[PDB]
Design an enzyme around this catalytic site. Structure first.
Site, PDB file in Angstrom:
ATOM      1  N   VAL A  26     -30.053  78.037 -38.633  1.00 42.19           N
ATOM      2  CA  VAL A  26     -29.233  77.523 -39.741  1.00 42.19           C
ATOM      3  C   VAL A  26     -28.623  76.127 -39.523  1.00 42.19           C
ATOM      4  CG1 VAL A  26     -28.653  79.923 -40.358  1.00 42.19           C
ATOM      5  CG2 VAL A  26     -26.957  78.460 -39.293  1.00 42.19           C
ATOM      6  N   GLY A  27     -28.710  75.613 -38.306  1.00 41.81           N
ATOM      7  CA  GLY A  27     -28.117  74.328 -38.017  1.00 41.81           C
ATOM      8  C   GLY A  27     -28.297  73.955 -36.574  1.00 41.81           C
ATOM      9  N   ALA A  30     -26.342  67.887 -31.309  1.00 44.36           N
ATOM     10  CA  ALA A  30     -26.314  67.515 -29.899  1.00 44.36           C
ATOM     11  C   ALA A  30     -25.664  68.583 -29.031  1.00 44.36           C
ATOM     12  CB  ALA A  30     -25.595  66.171 -29.714  1.00 44.36           C
ATOM     13  N   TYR A  31     -24.585  69.200 -29.529  1.00 41.74           N
ATOM     14  CA  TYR A  31     -23.801  70.130 -28.719  1.00 41.74           C
ATOM     15  C   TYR A  31     -24.240  71.598 -28.790  1.00 41.74           C
ATOM     16  CZ  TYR A  31     -20.324  66.416 -27.792  1.00 41.74           C
ATOM     17  OH  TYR A  31     -19.671  65.250 -27.398  1.00 41.74           O
ATOM     18  N   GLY A  32     -25.214  71.920 -29.640  1.00 42.70           N
ATOM     19  CA  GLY A  32     -25.601  73.309 -29.823  1.00 42.70           C
ATOM     20  C   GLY A  32     -26.424  73.561 -31.071  1.00 42.70           C
ATOM     21  N   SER A  33     -26.865  74.804 -31.230  1.00 38.82           N
ATOM     22  CA  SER A  33     -27.615  75.227 -32.406  1.00 38.82           C
ATOM     23  C   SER A  33     -27.090  76.578 -32.839  1.00 38.82           C
ATOM     24  CB  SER A  33     -29.102  75.338 -32.082  1.00 38.82           C
ATOM     25  OG  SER A  33     -29.729  74.058 -32.219  1.00 38.82           O
ATOM     26  N   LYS A  49     -23.996  80.994 -32.057  1.00 37.06           N
ATOM     27  CA  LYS A  49     -24.035  79.599 -31.627  1.00 37.06           C
ATOM     28  C   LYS A  49     -24.472  79.529 -30.169  1.00 37.06           C
ATOM     29  CE  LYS A  49     -21.102  75.473 -31.115  1.00 37.06           C
ATOM     30  NZ  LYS A  49     -19.749  74.964 -31.410  1.00 37.06           N
ATOM     31  N   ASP A 164     -15.032  75.128 -37.102  1.00 36.31           N
ATOM     32  CA  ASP A 164     -15.478  73.784 -36.806  1.00 36.31           C
ATOM     33  C   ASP A 164     -16.882  73.856 -36.250  1.00 36.31           C
ATOM     34  OD1 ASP A 164     -16.000  71.154 -35.922  1.00 36.31           O
ATOM     35  OD2 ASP A 164     -14.053  70.896 -35.077  1.00 36.31           O
TER      36      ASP A 164
HETATM   37  C1  LIG Z   1     -10.237  77.185 -34.070  1.00 40.28           C
HETATM   38  C2  LIG Z   1     -10.837  75.916 -34.661  1.00 40.28           C
HETATM   39  C3  LIG Z   1      -9.862  74.755 -34.391  1.00 40.28           C
HETATM   40  C4  LIG Z   1     -10.979  76.083 -36.188  1.00 40.28           C
HETATM   41  C5  LIG Z   1     -12.179  75.762 -33.973  1.00 40.28           C
HETATM   42  C6  LIG Z   1     -13.295  76.563 -34.248  1.00 40.28           C
HETATM   43  C7  LIG Z   1     -14.266  76.083 -33.363  1.00 40.28           C
HETATM   44  N1  LIG Z   1     -15.570  76.446 -33.129  1.00 40.28           N
HETATM   45  C8  LIG Z   1     -16.369  76.980 -34.079  1.00 40.28           C
HETATM   46  O1  LIG Z   1     -15.970  77.155 -35.232  1.00 40.28           O
HETATM   47  N2  LIG Z   1     -17.609  77.320 -33.713  1.00 40.28           N
HETATM   48  C9  LIG Z   1     -18.625  77.834 -34.515  1.00 40.28           C
HETATM   49  C10 LIG Z   1     -18.997  77.109 -35.672  1.00 40.28           C
HETATM   50  C11 LIG Z   1     -20.049  77.522 -36.501  1.00 40.28           C
HETATM   51  C12 LIG Z   1     -20.751  78.694 -36.190  1.00 40.28           C
HETATM   52  C13 LIG Z   1     -20.394  79.435 -35.067  1.00 40.28           C
HETATM   53  C14 LIG Z   1     -21.116  80.598 -34.794  1.00 40.28           C
HETATM   54  C15 LIG Z   1     -20.792  81.385 -33.695  1.00 40.28           C
HETATM   55  C16 LIG Z   1     -19.747  80.988 -32.865  1.00 40.28           C
HETATM   56  C17 LIG Z   1     -19.040  79.800 -33.115  1.00 40.28           C
HETATM   57  C18 LIG Z   1     -19.345  79.015 -34.226  1.00 40.28           C
HETATM   58  N3  LIG Z   1     -13.689  75.096 -32.627  1.00 40.28           N
HETATM   59  C19 LIG Z   1     -14.206  74.313 -31.655  1.00 40.28           C
HETATM   60  C20 LIG Z   1     -13.424  74.002 -30.523  1.00 40.28           C
HETATM   61  C21 LIG Z   1     -13.853  73.189 -29.473  1.00 40.28           C
HETATM   62  C22 LIG Z   1     -15.113  72.631 -29.528  1.00 40.28           C
HETATM   63  C23 LIG Z   1     -15.587  71.759 -28.379  1.00 40.28           C
HETATM   64  O2  LIG Z   1     -14.511  70.955 -27.875  1.00 40.28           O
HETATM   65  C24 LIG Z   1     -15.939  72.904 -30.636  1.00 40.28           C
HETATM   66  C25 LIG Z   1     -15.475  73.728 -31.664  1.00 40.28           C
HETATM   67  N4  LIG Z   1     -12.372  74.866 -32.986  1.00 40.28           N
END
Ligand SMILES: CC(C)(C)c1cc(NC(=O)Nc2cccc3ccccc23)n(-c2ccc(CO)cc2)n1
Length: 348
Positions: A26-27, A30-33, A49, A164
């Site tokens: 689905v997406g 650089a940092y993941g899929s 992810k 995010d």
């Molecule tokens: C709590 C909040 C502030 C809203 C947040 C949420 C996330 N990470 C994600 O939402 N990850 C994921 C995004 C999309 C699908 C996923 C599907 C499965 C699992 C996760 C997934 N992050 C996040 C934090 C730190 C980093 C790297 O520094 C990247 C993302 N931060």
């Protein structure tokens, strides 16, 4: 330990427990899929992810730890939660991949603003949930920083979660030109005016709420400067007080070059909007981040009278991000991540 099976999808290996079936891409970034899947154990459609080379560098290693730590802490109806985290590795020595699992949403706020004719009540409910999620996130001293429609998951019942994707680097190039990656950003973060705080996310909420109300991007600048001018046209050029809080002397000098403009009348910009919406927008879209309404304050605003319940807008458990200022080697970040994988306890 579950049995894992191997699959290739878009040149990426996925090695996941058998419980996850019908993996579909689905997406990517650089940092993941990310893939969609069906979790045979819970009966849920999920998103998985897979982090790209999580311990390839200190920056990847620490980002991997950071996201896991964060997702493990998030327990709120309006914020992404972690259903599962797994690795095919049987030991720390073997440990080289991390996979994160959550509810599949497949449908973001873009899929709503452009299609549906949204009523004022829809807008109330959608923004209410954002702010309810933000109150929780902000109570843990977490700043989203990148709030925008594609980071809001919405189901058929208009139920919303903040997430995010976080697949992209956010390089200079990524923020350049006529791009949605920049249009929802607070000006103080867009132009690095000062050390910013959690009010950056409130500006983003104002931009989103405006767009739900009009069906149009609030500040679709063709570049940083063009966007700044759109902003200042609406909200006024900064006064003396704000100018001195712009600690970047370079940014300060540029902004003082600008022909002064008064704040516009928002009732004349958002024609026909609920006057309570207008009032809330004026409180969110304040140039000085010290004076913007907070998420907790906004939940109590009359616009949300039909939804607000002060006994049902919970705060987060204390989140210890002391690690953010910790200076560690790749293998130390890796071992910390491993501890977090191994100790994960799934939701009831
Ligand atoms: C709590 C909040 C502030 C809203 C947040 C949420 C996330 N990470 C994600 O939402 N990850 C994921 C995004 C999309 C699908 C996923 C599907 C499965 C699992 C996760 C997934 N992050 C996040 C934090 C730190 C980093 C790297 O520094 C990247 C993302 N931060």
């Amino acid at each position: 330990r579950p049995t894992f099976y191997r699959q290739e999808l878009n040149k990426t290996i996925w090695e996941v427990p058998e419980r996850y079936q019908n993996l579909s891409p689905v997406g990517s970034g650089a940092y993941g899929s990310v893939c969609a899947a069906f979790d045979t154990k819970t009966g849920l459609r999920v998103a998985v992810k897979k982090l790209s080379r999580p311990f390839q560098s200190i920056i990847h290693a620490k980002r991997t730890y950071r996201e896991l730590r964060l997702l493990k802490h998030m327990k709120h109806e309006n914020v992404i939660g972690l259903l599962d985290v797994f690795t095919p590795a049987r030991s720390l020595e073997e440990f080289n991949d991390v996979y994160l699992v959550t509810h599949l949403m497949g449908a973001d706020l873009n899929n709503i603003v452009k299609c549906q004719k949204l009523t004022d009540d829809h807008v109330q409910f959608l923004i209410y949930q954002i702010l309810r999620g933000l109150k929780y996130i902000h109570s843990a001293d977490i700043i989203h920083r990148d709030l925008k429609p594609s980071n809001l998951a919405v189901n058929e019942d208009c139920e919303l979660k903040i997430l995010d994707f976080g697949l992209a680097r956010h390089t200079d190039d990524e923020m350049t030109g006529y791009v949605a990656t920049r249009w929802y950003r607070a000006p103080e973060i867009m132009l690095n005016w000062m050390h910013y705080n959690q009010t950056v996310d409130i500006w983003s909420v104002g931009c989103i709420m405006a767009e739900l109300l009009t069906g149009r991007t609030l500040f679709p600048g063709t570049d940083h400067i063009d966007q700044l001018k759109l902003i200042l046209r609406l909200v006024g050029t900064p006064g003396a007080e704000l100018l001195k809080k712009i600690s970047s002397e370079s940014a300060r000098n540029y902004i003082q070059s600008l022909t002064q403009m008064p704040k516009m009348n928002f009732a004349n910009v958002f024609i026909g909007a609920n006057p309570l919406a207008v009032d809330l927008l004026e409180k969110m879209l304040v140039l000085d981040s010290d004076k913007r309404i907070t998420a907790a304050q906004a939940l109590a605003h009359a616009y949300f009278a039909q939804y607000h319940d002060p006994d049902d807008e919970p705060v987060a458990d204390p989140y210890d991000q002391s690690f953010e200022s910790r200076d560690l080697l790749i293998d130390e970040w890796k071992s910390l991540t491993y501890d977090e994988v191994i100790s994960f306890v799934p939701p009831p």
